[PDB]
Design a protein around this ligand. Structure first.
Ligand SMILES: *[C@@H]1O[C@H](CO)[C@@H](O)[C@H](O)[C@H]1NC(C)=O
Lengths: 50, 49
């Protein structure tokens, strides 16, 4: 990964956000969302994901 | 009283409106849930060499 003072920004486009493939590999200790409820993420389409 | 044992990183998913693996396929709380949630570490009881 990158250092915190040189954090890495990547553009994400033309994909399907399933996020159920991460259930086997990694477990997340912190997961928060602002401006949108977590349970509504499967019913939405975004514009510019960074 | 509903009792179970879950991983220490998945304790945050026992809450109304949460998402993840436990909250989607194992145990889900209602949105208008009233009551309390208690959780404590049991590494000296449920773990063995
Ligand atoms: C992914 O799942 C398989 C079985 O579905 C399991 O054997 C494997 O251990 C899992 N991956 C990790 C990193 O635990």
């Amino acid at each position: 990964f990158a250092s915190v003072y040189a954090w890495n920004r990547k553009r994400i486009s033309n994909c399907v956000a399933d996020y159920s493939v991460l259930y086997n590999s990694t477990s997340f200790s912190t997961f928060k969302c602002y401006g949108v409820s977590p349970t509504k993420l499967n019913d939405l389409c975004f514009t510019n994901v960074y | 009283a509903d009792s179970f044992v879950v991983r220490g990183d998945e304790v945050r998913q026992i809450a109304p409106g949460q998402t993840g693996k436990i909250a989607d396929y194992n145990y889900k709380l209602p949105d208008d849930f009233t009551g309390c949630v208690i959780a404590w570490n049991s590494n000296n009881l449920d773990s063995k060499v």
